[PDB]
Design a protein around this ligand. Structure first.
Ligand SMILES: CN(CCO)c1ccc(Br)cn1
Ligand SMILES: CN(CCO)c1ccc(Br)cn1
Ligand SMILES: CN(CCO)c1ccc(Br)cn1
Ligand SMILES: CN(CCO)c1ccc(Br)cn1
Lengths: 546, 546
């Protein structure tokens, strides 16, 4: 029985095959059939191309040698290559045209999800072209999804040489009959077959996946749409910035391009953005996913006033100063969404663009106490329960697994009221001791939050709600302002606390406001609807953030 | 006696004054004299500009109000503003034209170096213009050199209001007579004077500095050229990446733009790049200053083979993979310079460009043992002394302060032979027990290296020299290759081990090689000649790295 799946890159994990353009170039130029494919493979094992694939020479060194072979072939065929024939132009164009074969990658992802060891075995080259970054990017995106990447130019061996297959089996730590091997070249398939490996000759992807599905007994074709790539905490770059003597902020960092600072809500973590981090980095951004003050690896001082909006915002500005960033786009959810609007109001020069999930922008009412305002809305009762220091901490810290399992639920899975929490005497009063696991989360993901909250607990996080007066007084200073920088408001249909309707007058204070709306989405937006959130954020970032 | 110096921004720390363009715009357009300056200050404390400076409104909201004032003033003057009059265009142009007043900043730097508390007190605005980043960058560069930055739009007060001065004194924790206050506006100087502060009306910088020099008794004018900005380790962003189960790599990160990976030599630290990090980040690059494997906060496994070039290079590739970087420019010095050439030879697709300080590229000789090659050069005797595990560790770890003080010396300050080290029986045999402190380093900087080396000592670092055979065998695989990616070789006249002459045949293997040469420079290039290194690196990065 199989337990390993090996994939070729060209014509298998990536399409159109860079190789298949030789035939297209031949036809486009009306060159004799197979001329370019013939010059490419000239001299076989002793030839220029084999030396390139074994890593003896670089792609830029190979280019003049391929030109020489093209001439010799044309001389023999008694044809003339055109006046403006260029190998570099042809190969630049072909490499740039090559894309990941999404359905093939999804099958590799599904196999690996089921316990398969996966690898990419490719005949490739050391690319030193001025345009090499395009290929570097493609390989980067692809390789992260596999246990191994075996490149001919790095191992000094090539398919179809039998040694590369013995090397592959050694790397996989598997006997040949345990391996399914996919390749678009019959000649490169033959040694794997001769070894007794299961082999699939790849022509069209769907037939190749049908063969793969039959041989593995795992459904790979016609499967439900998969979730976006998540984060493994131990595989991320972890950053730490001291913003002041007793406060340090922790963040996870991924990608290159414009800085995108992600700001979670209550009671969350940088990990609440697990589905957004890989997607936004892949979209061309440098993601900085915060552990907000009071959370995870960031400092959690006990004082209530350390958590007022003015202090939190000042610290996020220091955070940018220390990292040497003049701006960042700020994207927040829940309490993070609130912080992000205040960053736009008080520090617009440091805010490239601003986006909030669920949290609307509502200006402070100077004629009403914030406690009066909270009292007027029944769904905000939990906020009054959070006021008294120690009360909500004791309940929320009593059983961490129960806390997160009760909180992190989709709109059709609640066990939690949110109204009459004070009268009831607690958040989990009518709650099971052993809540069922939400479809949104795995047990492992819940345990991650449990482990993070063991460090500082709920004091710092609850302190975000204990600055209503202070926040109101500070917010009143911004009453004559408008948000005129690029802004996005994302509403969640089924957030029964931060209801879409509460964002209805935002255009009065943000005239150029752009919107996104997510149907059948509860409070935990990022994990409830990650695909939709990623789609909305990437589209808005590319159009309005640069 | 003075102990604090306060500087205005517009017309003092930054020139030309954004304000002084109103007069220039008036003349360029042949508008009545003072018309634009008059519309700008219209309504005084109750006017649009004061509201902007107090942070009541943003710059984009102020623009239409200034236009309205410009019209009213022109109506009264009985003039017509031209057909195409735009406040936005004028102010965008003026802000963009404004630069740091380098001699004023240098005086502020010198005062602070002498124990002065320094601050910037400015009447400024909340900039939400599409072009706001230019100003954000300028403020970022400037503020890092001061103890405080007090912005009118953030404090809700403006000069000349007396409250802002009381606020300034409070922030400084100083009585007025202890403060020297510099401003280009006589009206904004008057309240500070009325308080009894020493005040300087700034017209031309040189006279203002002459006044400042007289009042403080500190030489600020005609001083020797200062060293580039250094790094305070506690103020940096520290990054950590696990490259494999037992190996994690630590780095310091600063700036935005193309990734520039700095690779130190033996026996150094990320801190060896202290003078390059702020300069390269200011030049428009994202600097990643490594603690190479075996050093500082990076892992230091004991096994010799963990330090061969192949393993070290594979790990630097994993390092880029985990950070999500398809490429980085690699700049190395000494052993780091050696690694960087091998990154270019084996991983050109991951190397944007390559630069080495002192370390030449010399291809492996397949007809001679590497030990034979080392033996042939008398200056490389120390490398034979380093071979025997434990011998050099015991000597180098015996007294860390003595080790670094003996090693880190300019070409005219040696206490260290380097040849006949084996025959002598040690590196420090003819060395003082208490070496004098080199002009290159402070006691504090030496103590930083001492503290870093207390964690893992010299085993890992010395292991870089214990892989001669392994490195030679691996290097021989690259004998048919050429380095064709952008490359820079920087030679140091007085490096008596890595002599400029050893780089003479590099063009045979790197045909497009660019060069830099530093006169009167010893082995410790980055700290010996930081200004020159920064100049060479920035020029090459801007021309060849993007
Ligand atoms: C804002 N958070 C805090 C309440 O615990 C939140 C979480 C769950 C739901 Br449901 C609504 N709001
Ligand atoms: C973000 N929500 C937090 C809901 O838990 C919020 C924002 C501002 C105020 Br006031 C109250 N709630
Ligand atoms: C390469 N390092 C190691 C020698 O200790 C080096 C340091 C000092 C001098 Br001087 C020359 N080379
Ligand atoms: C960089 N230098 C280290 C001098 O300490 C070097 C590089 C390669 C070989 Br082999 C020997 N020395």
């Amino acid at each position: 029985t199989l337990r390993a799946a090996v994939f070729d890159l060209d014509g298998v994990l990536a399409l159109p095959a860079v190789f298949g353009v030789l035939g297209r170039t031949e036809e486009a130029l009306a060159l004799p059939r197979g001329l370019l494919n013939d010059a490419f493979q000239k001299g076989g094992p002793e030839g220029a191309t084999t030396r390139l694939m074994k890593g003896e020479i670089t792609l830029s060194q190979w280019i003049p040698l391929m030109e020489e072979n093209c001439r010799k072939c044309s001389e023999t065929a008694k044809v003339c290559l055109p006046k403006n024939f260029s190998i570099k132009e042809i190969f630049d164009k072909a490499i740039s045209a090559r894309k990941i074969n999404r359905p093939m990658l999804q099958a590799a992802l599904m196999l690996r999800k089921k316990g398969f060891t996966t690898a990419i075995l490719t005949n490739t080259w050391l690319d030193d072209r001025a345009e090499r970054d395009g290929l570097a990017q493609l390989m980067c995106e692809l390789k992260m999804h596999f246990d191994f990447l075996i490149e001919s130019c790095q191992v000094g061996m090539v398919k179809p040489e039998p040694q590369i297959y013995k090397f592959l089996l050694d790397t996989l730590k598997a006997s040949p009959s345990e391996v399914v091997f996919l390749d678009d070249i019959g000649a490169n398939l033959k040694p794997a077959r001769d070894l007794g490996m299961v082999t699939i000759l790849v022509q069209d992807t769907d037939t190749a996946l049908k063969e793969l599905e039959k041989v593995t007994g795992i459904q790979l074709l016609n499967t439900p749409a998969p979730l976006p790539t998540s984060c493994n905490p131990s595989d991320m770059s972890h950053g730490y910035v001291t913003v002041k003597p007793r406060v340090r902020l922790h963040f996870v960092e991924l990608g290159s391009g414009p800085a995108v600072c992600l700001c979670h809500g209550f009671p969350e973590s940088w990990y609440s953005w697990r589905y957004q981090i890989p997607a936004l980095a892949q979209a061309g951004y440098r993601v900085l996913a915060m552990d907000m003050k009071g959370y995870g690896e960031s400092s959690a001082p006990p004082e209530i006033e350390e958590y007022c909006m003015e202090v939190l915002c000042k610290e996020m500005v220091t955070f940018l100063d220390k990292l040497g960033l003049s701006q960042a786009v700020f994207i927040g959810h829940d309490w993070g969404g609130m912080l992000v609007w205040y960053m736009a109001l008080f520090y617009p020069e440091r805010v490239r663009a601003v986006a909030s999930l669920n949290t609307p922008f509502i200006p402070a009412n100077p004629n009403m106490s914030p406690l009066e305002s909270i009292k007027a809305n029944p769904v905000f009762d939990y906020q009054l329960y959070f006021q008294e220091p120690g009360v909500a901490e004791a309940e929320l810290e009593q059983n961490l697994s129960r806390t997160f399992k009760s909180l992190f639920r989709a709109s059709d899975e609640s066990v939690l009221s949110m109204h009459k929490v004070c009268e009831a005497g607690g958040l989990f009063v009518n709650s099971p001791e052993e809540p069922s696991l939400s479809r949104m989360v795995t047990e492992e993901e819940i345990q991650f939050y449990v482990q993070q909250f063991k460090k500082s607990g709920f004091r710092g996080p609850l302190n975000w709600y204990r600055n209503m007066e202070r926040n109101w007084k500070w917010a009143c200073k911004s009453l004559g302002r408008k948000i005129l920088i690029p802004a996005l408001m994302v509403t969640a249909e089924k957030d029964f606390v931060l209801v879409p309707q509460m964002s209805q007058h935002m255009e009065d204070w943000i005239p150029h406001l752009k919107r996104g709306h997510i149907e059948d989405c509860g409070h935990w937006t990022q994990m409830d609807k990650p695909t939709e959130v990623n789609q909305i954020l990437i589209k808005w970032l590319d159009s309005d953030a640069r």
